[PDB]
Design a protein around this motif. Structure first.
Motif, PDB file in Angstrom:
ATOM      1  N   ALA A  79       0.874  -1.099   0.009  1.00  0.00           N
ATOM      2  CA  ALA A  79      -0.004  -0.043  -0.118  1.00  0.00           C
ATOM      3  C   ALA A  79       0.801   1.210  -0.031  1.00  0.00           C
ATOM      4  O   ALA A  79       0.454   2.172  -0.625  1.00  0.00           O
ATOM      5  N   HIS A  80       1.932   1.372   0.660  1.00  0.00           N
ATOM      6  CA  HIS A  80       2.816   2.321   0.630  1.00  0.00           C
ATOM      7  C   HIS A  80       3.271   2.743  -0.393  1.00  0.00           C
ATOM      8  O   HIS A  80       3.308   4.094  -0.983  1.00  0.00           O
ATOM      9  N   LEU A  81       3.789   1.990  -1.356  1.00  0.00           N
ATOM     10  CA  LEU A  81       4.353   1.973  -2.775  1.00  0.00           C
ATOM     11  C   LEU A  81       3.523   2.481  -3.691  1.00  0.00           C
ATOM     12  O   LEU A  81       3.847   3.525  -4.414  1.00  0.00           O
ATOM     13  N   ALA A  82       2.202   1.916  -3.529  1.00  0.00           N
ATOM     14  CA  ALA A  82       1.020   2.059  -4.313  1.00  0.00           C
ATOM     15  C   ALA A  82       0.865   3.494  -3.903  1.00  0.00           C
ATOM     16  O   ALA A  82       0.560   4.404  -5.100  1.00  0.00           O
ATOM     17  N   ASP A  83       0.444   4.051  -3.164  1.00  0.00           N
ATOM     18  CA  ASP A  83       0.104   5.396  -2.637  1.00  0.00           C
ATOM     19  C   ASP A  83       1.263   6.472  -3.120  1.00  0.00           C
ATOM     20  O   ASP A  83       0.742   7.381  -3.626  1.00  0.00           O
ATOM     21  N   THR A  84       2.390   6.137  -2.777  1.00  0.00           N
ATOM     22  CA  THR A  84       3.414   7.139  -3.094  1.00  0.00           C
ATOM     23  C   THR A  84       3.918   7.129  -4.556  1.00  0.00           C
ATOM     24  O   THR A  84       4.635   8.272  -4.854  1.00  0.00           O
ATOM     25  N   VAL A 108       2.809   7.942 -13.343  1.00  0.00           N
ATOM     26  CA  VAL A 108       1.696   7.396 -12.875  1.00  0.00           C
ATOM     27  C   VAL A 108       0.403   8.061 -12.559  1.00  0.00           C
ATOM     28  O   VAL A 108       1.010   9.193 -11.654  1.00  0.00           O
ATOM     29  N   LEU A 109      -0.619   8.134 -12.877  1.00  0.00           N
ATOM     30  CA  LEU A 109      -1.655   9.002 -12.544  1.00  0.00           C
ATOM     31  C   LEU A 109      -2.734   8.662 -11.506  1.00  0.00           C
ATOM     32  O   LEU A 109      -2.852   9.798 -10.625  1.00  0.00           O
ATOM     33  N   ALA A 110      -2.772   7.501 -11.202  1.00  0.00           N
ATOM     34  CA  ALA A 110      -3.962   7.153 -10.254  1.00  0.00           C
ATOM     35  C   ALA A 110      -4.077   5.699 -10.273  1.00  0.00           C
ATOM     36  O   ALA A 110      -3.431   4.921 -11.156  1.00  0.00           O
ATOM     37  N   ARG A 111      -4.375   5.394  -8.898  1.00  0.00           N
ATOM     38  CA  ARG A 111      -5.042   3.962  -8.968  1.00  0.00           C
ATOM     39  C   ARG A 111      -6.155   3.762  -9.896  1.00  0.00           C
ATOM     40  O   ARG A 111      -6.865   4.656  -9.950  1.00  0.00           O
ATOM     41  N   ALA A 112      -6.418   2.683 -10.768  1.00  0.00           N
ATOM     42  CA  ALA A 112      -7.437   2.394 -11.406  1.00  0.00           C
ATOM     43  C   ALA A 112      -8.780   2.044 -10.884  1.00  0.00           C
ATOM     44  O   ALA A 112      -8.761   1.515  -9.525  1.00  0.00           O
ATOM     45  N   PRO A 113      -9.847   2.545 -10.938  1.00  0.00           N
ATOM     46  CA  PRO A 113     -11.045   2.270 -10.563  1.00  0.00           C
ATOM     47  C   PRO A 113     -11.388   0.800 -10.874  1.00  0.00           C
ATOM     48  O   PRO A 113     -10.705   0.173 -11.992  1.00  0.00           O
ATOM     49  N   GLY A 141      11.932  -4.663 -10.736  1.00  0.00           N
ATOM     50  CA  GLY A 141      13.080  -3.623 -11.099  1.00  0.00           C
ATOM     51  C   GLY A 141      13.125  -2.806 -12.359  1.00  0.00           C
ATOM     52  O   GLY A 141      13.842  -2.209 -12.911  1.00  0.00           O
ATOM     53  N   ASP A 142      11.622  -3.022 -13.151  1.00  0.00           N
ATOM     54  CA  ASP A 142      11.321  -2.471 -14.424  1.00  0.00           C
ATOM     55  C   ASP A 142      10.703  -1.118 -14.408  1.00  0.00           C
ATOM     56  O   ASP A 142      10.340  -0.682 -15.406  1.00  0.00           O
ATOM     57  N   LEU A 143      10.519  -0.665 -13.250  1.00  0.00           N
ATOM     58  CA  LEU A 143       9.742   0.761 -13.091  1.00  0.00           C
ATOM     59  C   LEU A 143      10.692   1.603 -12.033  1.00  0.00           C
ATOM     60  O   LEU A 143      10.756   0.928 -10.791  1.00  0.00           O
ATOM     61  N   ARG A 144      11.083   2.368 -12.217  1.00  0.00           N
ATOM     62  CA  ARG A 144      11.905   3.364 -11.553  1.00  0.00           C
ATOM     63  C   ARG A 144      11.192   4.847 -11.440  1.00  0.00           C
ATOM     64  O   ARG A 144      10.739   5.504 -12.450  1.00  0.00           O
ATOM     65  N   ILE A 145      11.117   5.062 -10.049  1.00  0.00           N
ATOM     66  CA  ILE A 145      10.474   6.630  -9.705  1.00  0.00           C
ATOM     67  C   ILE A 145      11.538   7.691  -9.839  1.00  0.00           C
ATOM     68  O   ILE A 145      12.740   7.419  -9.388  1.00  0.00           O
ATOM     69  N   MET A 146      11.319   8.611 -10.600  1.00  0.00           N
ATOM     70  CA  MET A 146      12.194   9.702 -10.824  1.00  0.00           C
ATOM     71  C   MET A 146      12.273  10.625  -9.599  1.00  0.00           C
ATOM     72  O   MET A 146      11.056  10.844  -9.085  1.00  0.00           O
ATOM     73  N   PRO A 147      13.514  11.346  -9.243  1.00  0.00           N
ATOM     74  CA  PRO A 147      13.450  12.085  -8.171  1.00  0.00           C
ATOM     75  C   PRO A 147      12.491  13.415  -8.402  1.00  0.00           C
ATOM     76  O   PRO A 147      12.459  13.722  -9.641  1.00  0.00           O
ATOM     77  N   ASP A 148      11.813  14.051  -7.645  1.00  0.00           N
ATOM     78  CA  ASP A 148      11.125  15.285  -7.852  1.00  0.00           C
ATOM     79  C   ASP A 148      10.307  15.845  -6.581  1.00  0.00           C
ATOM     80  O   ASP A 148       9.465  15.065  -6.208  1.00  0.00           O
TER      81      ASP A 148
END
Ligand SMILES: [Cl-]
Ligand SMILES: [Mg+2]
Lengths: 196, 9
Positions: A79-84, A108-113, A141-148
């Motif tokens: 849930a943490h990773l999903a939310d952040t 990443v825009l939103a959790r899908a409904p 390891g195929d999705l990396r979050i960019m710093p911002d």
């Protein structure tokens, strides 16, 4: 006149373009657009894009059937990773037909409904709405979050081409309010644009 | 990694 609420339902229907055969489709209705309740967002089995169709009005649709099948509810694995992850720029790794690595910049825009473990995502070089179970990619390891409002308004997208596209703003992204979804009249994709 | 689906139209 009368319609049932079909958000969250599994559906199947035929589709006919021009002079071709009717083709058969099965999918999940994710949403009914508040600023245009004739318009539904649909995820078709085995296709990555989210589509917008006026299911009850579009003459290309035939034999529309609402199934009794219930989409399963899973709790997301982290849930943490999903939310952040929501609202974040990402580098999303794919591989292509030859099997070589192919990295796409996205957001990443939103959790899908409805489909609880899936996420709305769009890409810099392909700015339409996609949906994937992105926690799987992250774990590998195929999705990396960019710093911002504009919602419901008729708009047009002008080109150097000279022609333009007409559409409606149908959604404002909660996590990133400068970003909007647009439905263009000529097209069943959902376009994603930063309007500031 | 996921494979990218062939572009449509
Ligand atoms: Cl890219
Ligand atoms: Mg790159």
């Amino acid at each position: 006149s009368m319609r049932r609420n079909i958000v969250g339902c599994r559906i199947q229907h035929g589709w006919k373009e021009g002079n071709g055969p009717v083709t058969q489709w099965k999918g999940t209705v994710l949403d009914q657009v508040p600023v245009n309740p004739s318009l539904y967002l649909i995820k078709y089995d085995g296709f990555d894009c989210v589509y917008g169709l006026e299911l009850n009005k579009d003459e290309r649709v035939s034999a529309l059937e609402v199934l009794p099948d219930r989409v399963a509810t899973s709790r997301i694995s982290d849930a943490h990773l999903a939310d952040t992850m929501i609202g974040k720029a990402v580098e999303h790794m794919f591989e292509t037909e030859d099997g070589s690595k192919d990295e796409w910049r996205g957001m990443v825009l939103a959790r899908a409904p409805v489909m609880n473990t899936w996420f709305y995502i769009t890409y810099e070089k392909d700015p339409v709405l996609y949906m994937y179970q992105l926690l799987d990619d992250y774990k590998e390891g195929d999705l990396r979050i960019m710093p911002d409002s504009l919602v419901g308004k008729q708009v047009e997208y002008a080109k150097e081409d000279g022609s333009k596209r007409t559409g409606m703003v149908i959604h404002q992204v909660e996590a990133k309010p400068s970003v909007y979804f647009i439905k263009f009249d000529d097209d069943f994709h959902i376009y994603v644009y930063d309007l500031v | 990694a996921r494979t990218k689906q062939t572009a449509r139209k």
